[PDB]
């Protein structure tokens, strides 16, 4: 459920004395990976990761591939600068990550924008929601802040986010319509395992659903129950769908008082299920 979205997750990893740093850029529309670039590839190039992407012309691929080379240069340089700012030795490996893009409202106009940077997996600098001011995580990032405040970096980003980002998103949605905007309903069931003396584990299963956005919850006597509910990370089935489960420990003999609720956009009505013997 929600606003449509576009993002890029870009990463560079330094390989001191083993070559150039590894560079990878992954693109997403509505949280679906649709393009990818890996520098360690044999013909480093942006590749379509979705079938509806294969309708772009060769020149699309060339141009973005050029961007990628520019980006490699960018990351390499900034990786070196950061070694400076943090007083670190040049033989160690390090990470630089950039995440950016837009959420778009139903009108087709910009709801929210993102520009965020991490170094060695920790926050470095991020564009606030106003798209005008920066949050800097430490004094090293403060330097970049002053520098970017005087350079007008925020407007540069804002021009991309309000213009290019939204329009590309709109084109992509038009093209990938049939596959991006579909639903696969969850298949649900409950399983029963002994656990301790007088105690049993009930496990609610949700399988083969797309998209990944889902909510599972237990219930005692029709009231929501999340207390001590073990919930695992949503995981990919590997065929485009997801899985998830939720468990609770309940008294032996009292299982009939519990129910599992599944919420997902694919369902015409929420599921309510219980452990059914034999």
């Amino acid at each position: 459920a929600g606003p449509h979205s576009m993002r890029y997750f870009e990463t560079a990893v330094s390989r001191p004395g083993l070559g150039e740093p590894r560079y990878i850029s992954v693109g997403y529309v509505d949280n679906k990976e649709f393009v990818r670039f890996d520098s360690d590839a044999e013909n480093p190039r942006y590749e379509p990761q979705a079938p509806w992407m294969e309708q772009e012309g060769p020149e699309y691929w060339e141009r973005i591939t050029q961007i990628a080379k520019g980006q490699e240069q960018w990351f390499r340089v900034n990786l070196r600068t950061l070694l400076g700012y943090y007083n670190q030795s040049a033989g160690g490996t390090h990470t630089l990550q950039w995440m950016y893009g837009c959420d778009v409202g139903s009108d087709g106009r910009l709801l929210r924008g993102y520009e965020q940077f991490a170094y060695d997996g920790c926050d470095y600098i991020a564009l606030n929601e106003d798209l005008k001011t920066w949050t800097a995580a430490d004094m090293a990032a403060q330097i970049t802040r002053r520098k970017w405040e005087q350079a007008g970096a925020a407007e540069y980003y804002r021009a991309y986010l309000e213009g290019e980002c939204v329009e590309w998103l709109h084109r992509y949605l038009k093209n990938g319509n049939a596959t991006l905007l579909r639903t696969d309903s969850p298949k649900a069931h409950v399983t029963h395992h002994p656990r301790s003396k007088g105690e049993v584990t009930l496990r609610c299963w949700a399988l083969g659903f797309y998209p990944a956005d889902i909510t599972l919850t237990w219930q005692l006597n029709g009231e929501e129950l999340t207390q001590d509910m073990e919930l695992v990370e949503t995981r990919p089935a590997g065929d485009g769908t997801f899985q998830k489960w939720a468990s609770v420990v309940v008294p032996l003999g009292k299982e009939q008082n519990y129910t599992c609720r599944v919420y997902h956009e694919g369902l015409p009505e929420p599921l309510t299920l219980r452990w059914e013997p034999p």
Binding site: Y8, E10, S25, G27, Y60, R63, I64, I67, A68, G70, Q71, W74, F75, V77, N78, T81, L82, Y85, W98, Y100, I143, T144, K147, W148, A151, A153, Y156, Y160, E164, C165, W168
Partner: peptide, 9 residues
């Protein structure tokens, strides 16, 4: 379509 980071640290 992706974008230049452009600004430097």
């Amino acid at each position: 379509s992706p974008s230049y980071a452009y600004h430097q640290f």
